[PDB]
Structure 1
Amino acid sequence: HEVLLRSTETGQWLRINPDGTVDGTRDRSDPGIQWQISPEGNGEVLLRSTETGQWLRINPDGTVDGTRDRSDPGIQWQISPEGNGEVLLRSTETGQWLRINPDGTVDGTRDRSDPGIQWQISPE
């Protein structure tokens, strides 16, 4: 039950790379864009890469990458639907929203109005 996470603004997909970097791509065939959601309970989820097995992580320095440490505090996310399949993903640890920028970089922000925090989630 894989899902794709897609930018509403640009249509770019959230991708993880073999080196652990996380960014955006327009290549629908990239194997790094398939994710699996697992419940943590209490409204939290993990997002795990089908390709690499790494979980999506946000770090104290604001960077977003992947990790295989299931105990890392930065891998818990909260999906907040806004209606019509639009969602925000908020980090339990930092309080930031996951942001994909038009240039394909992925980081965090507290700006509710940033167009890059708007995500769609669709089955692959």
Structure 2
Amino acid sequence: PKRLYCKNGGFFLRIHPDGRVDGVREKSDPHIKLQLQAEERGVVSIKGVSANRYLAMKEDGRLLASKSVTDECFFFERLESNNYNTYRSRKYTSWYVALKRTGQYKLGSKTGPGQKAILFLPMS
């Protein structure tokens, strides 16, 4: 398990028990602890431990969490330079998981491979 800390603003990814996704700064938040499970090399589903919900990306780029697994709940995890990680949707293949600088998430339909918003340094 671990926390994903976004390089764009220093916000940790957070999955609430209601299915709401956002980024926090409080590093002791219980909702940022996540669990990543591999569906084989490169693919992973991300799960918010407490909430018990999986991060899912919708077709309009919005980000949210679902009690159950769906094709919108798997991401290609790629290790970048300096150890930052990026999560791209296995279904909306050119869309990444990302947070803006204000802390709120950023529509996957406005992301890209060289954005600071998609970078996450994982912290146990």
What TM-score do you get using the length of structure 2 for normalisation?
0.91
Among the aligned pairs, what percent are the same residue? Answer: 25
Deviations 1:21-62 (A, max 9, x none): 100100112111000111111421011111011001000121
Root mean square deviation, CA, Å: 1.3
Q: Whole-Å Cα distance in 1 between the matches of residues 64 and 104 of structure 2? A: 11
> Which residues of structure 2 form unaligned runs of 5+?
none
What corresponds to 2:88 in structure 1? Answer: 90
Q: Whole-Å Cα distance in 2 between the matches of residues 43 and 111 of structure 1? A: 18
Where is the strand percentage greater, Structure 1 or Structure 2?
1
Q: Whole-Å Cα distance in 1 between the matches of residues 118 and 100 of structure 2? A: 8
Deviations 1:53-112 (A, max 9, x none): 100100012110100122x11100111111221121111010101111011111313422
Q: Whole-Å Cα distance in 2 between the matches of residues 19 and 90 of structure 1? A: 23
**Counterpart of 1:74 in 2: which secondary structure?**
coil
8 Å CA contact retained: 2:17, 2:53: no
Runs of 4+ residues over 6 Å off in structure 1: none
Q: Whole-Å Cα distance in 2 between the matches of residues 101 and 110 of structure 1? A: 10
> Which residues of structure 1 form unaligned runs of 5+?
none
Shift of 1:114: 2.0
What corresponds to 1:122 in structure 2? Answer: 123
Q: Whole-Å Cα distance in 2 between the matches of residues 43 and 52 of structure 1? A: 24
Count of aligned residue pairs for this structure pair? 121
